[PDB]
Design a protein around this ligand. Sequence first.
Ligand code: SAH
Ligand code: SAH
Ligand code: OCA
Ligand code: OCA
Lengths: 356, 358
Amino acid sequence: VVVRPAPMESATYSQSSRLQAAGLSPAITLFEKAAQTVPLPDAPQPVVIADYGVATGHNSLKPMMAAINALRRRIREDRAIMVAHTDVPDNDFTALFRTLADDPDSYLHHDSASFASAVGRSFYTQILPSNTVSLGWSSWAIQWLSRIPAGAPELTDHVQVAYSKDERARAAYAHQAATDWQDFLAFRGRELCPGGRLVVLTMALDEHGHFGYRPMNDALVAALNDQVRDGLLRPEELRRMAIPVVARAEKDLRAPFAPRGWFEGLTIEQLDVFNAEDRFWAAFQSDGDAESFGAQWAGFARAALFPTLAAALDCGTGDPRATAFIEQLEASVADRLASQPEPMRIPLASLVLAKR
Amino acid sequence: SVVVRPAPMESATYSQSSRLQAAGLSPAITLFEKAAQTVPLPDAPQPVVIADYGVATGHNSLKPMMAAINALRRRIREDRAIMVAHTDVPDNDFTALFRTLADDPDSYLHHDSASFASAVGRSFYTQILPSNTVSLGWSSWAIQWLSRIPAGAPELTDHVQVAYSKDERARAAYAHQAATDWQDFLAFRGRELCPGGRLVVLTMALDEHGHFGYRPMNDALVAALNDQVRDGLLRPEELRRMAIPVVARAEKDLRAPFAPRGWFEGLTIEQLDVFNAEDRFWAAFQSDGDAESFGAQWAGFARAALFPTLAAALDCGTGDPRATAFIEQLEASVADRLASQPEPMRIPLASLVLAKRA
Ligand SMILES: Nc1ncnc2c1ncn2[C@@H]1O[C@H](CSCC[C@H](N)C(=O)O)[C@@H](O)[C@H]1O
Ligand SMILES: Nc1ncnc2c1ncn2[C@@H]1O[C@H](CSCC[C@H](N)C(=O)O)[C@@H](O)[C@H]1O
Ligand SMILES: CCCCCCCC(=O)O
Ligand SMILES: CCCCCCCC(=O)O
């Protein structure tokens, strides 16, 4: 009865998350700096790093290595560092453990006293022992709502609430995001060591209050409307489709802390709101390959969003119809964006949080 | 890879098909609970770590974990963190594990609000947890699985279990692989345990007479596989390729790394028992006379634990419908054969308590 989003498409996420990787690049610098200065546990207790919202692990390798390299300048080489990667139960943890074993960039291949574990429990509850996490990292994860809000109006003509014209829906999604953010902070506040640091990167609204990805969202909705026109999609199924993602404004991120600056033992040490460089547009300006441009954007949308859309179908998620739906939708979005390539806004927020 | 490994349990059926395992491990829970009463615990703010080596779906971990946690709660504050680290191979179904921990009312997460869960998908034949952090280790029905089919070992012609093979070279190769695997397992647990820590192991053993047990089951399985070849459902080449990388150890094998002075890599055997588990399927049949249920229980047990490893030998994919049909038919065949002539079976086990030097 509680409707939740779907995890990333395991088969394609590691190959289709270059946008996310490029966008989080500035946050790695913050994370590295946090690792250089954070108070550490008494030797020889293991130093714990937490990665909240790991998916396949591909985009975690660089931030984890940056922290580990920084820590190694401060501690003995034989001292244990434990990385706890967290996601939802239905995330593909086999893909994660294969990434950690097989990818040359894996920290396990670079540091002989580093260790890996996984936690498959929603990060909107406490999932690690209190006072044990020295360094927390979360990129591209917290924009995902814990649920479609209870009693929220069905998004009749849209898949993203920011583009919806239903005021009741907007408020319901906004309240859910506010409660989710409070919950996330409350439990990270318990998990962090005193003096510990948490670096968060999430989807944001820009200075004008816009969600961004405008041509993408237009292409997506149009491609879905074409499937109902061609009889590939039922009108009821399209009505049910919704992405439980909310992008937060600066004011939304600060809300739990106002006005004294603290919430559940945590404070905002640094906050930045910025637009990530549009690499797909930059590449297109260089090579003029419109088909490639369309394929890059469509692949990004597929791995991250399509499993959630496919969950609304009358058939099963393992049903061949769902696979056909995913592949057709990707090809249609690709064609639409390839026909008229345009730059897009990728609004992000980075935060450094510190525990008392 | 040219290194051939066993396959994990069938996650779809293991939680429903592991009552034999659950019943067999029951005596080891008592040992584990007793260990929990006195093992040293780590300095604050470190959680007490309980490691579960070879978790599968988690179904059979709930009882031993809760026994340890209950004992620990008689010693320490209710708000002290306890972390259970469940370990398996990368291709284990960890989603099934986390669903078990969230949904089963027997889950320690539902009974202890300061208990936590994690998973480690890295072979336990290497070190997979930080040195000196584990107070209590548990491993049931896992260490009999070889790290690999031994390199250069002859194809198990006419057999799927090496104990029943007539090939001397195959038997020796499997025995040597088991011996080095056991040394590896001990070496790395010896590093992971806290000084004074305890590890409880339950594994498949050879009985007093050096026998593997499950004889009627073994016979039914071989006969059923032969039926599939004869009926054109399985290629002769595929059956030749099939081998279960499982080795049951005698007392002497278990003691081998420790002999003669009693210690290996900081560990010693505190207690060792070798016993046959009560055959509950036979007991039920003696009570109710339901031969069909008898066959189904045995075949379900074999299916969940063994059939993925057999299916890996097929020329098709493991995700192919042909592999599913193979598993389903093999189960039905074994069930029918055992139902036709119900017989008691030997289930030889060994339980060990290992202690790390203080
Ligand atoms: N409540 C929740 N608890 C844990 N993980 C969640 C979650 N809601 C969403 N996620 C996870 O957040 C991930 C978003 S993809 C981000 C992956 C990676 N950090 C990167 O930067 O590319 C998905 O794996 C999704 O399953
Ligand atoms: N090298 C290895 N490392 C980790 N796990 C292994 C392994 N070899 C086999 N296993 C695991 O051991 C498990 C055996 S099933 C036993 C499950 C449970 N402990 C019970 O008592 O019922 C399987 O999940 C299998 O994947
Ligand atoms: C138009 C919305 C785009 C959402 C991107 C989500 C990225 C991720 O979760 O990895
Ligand atoms: C006849 C061989 C029986 C092997 C049982 C393996 C049980 C398990 O690994 O869970």
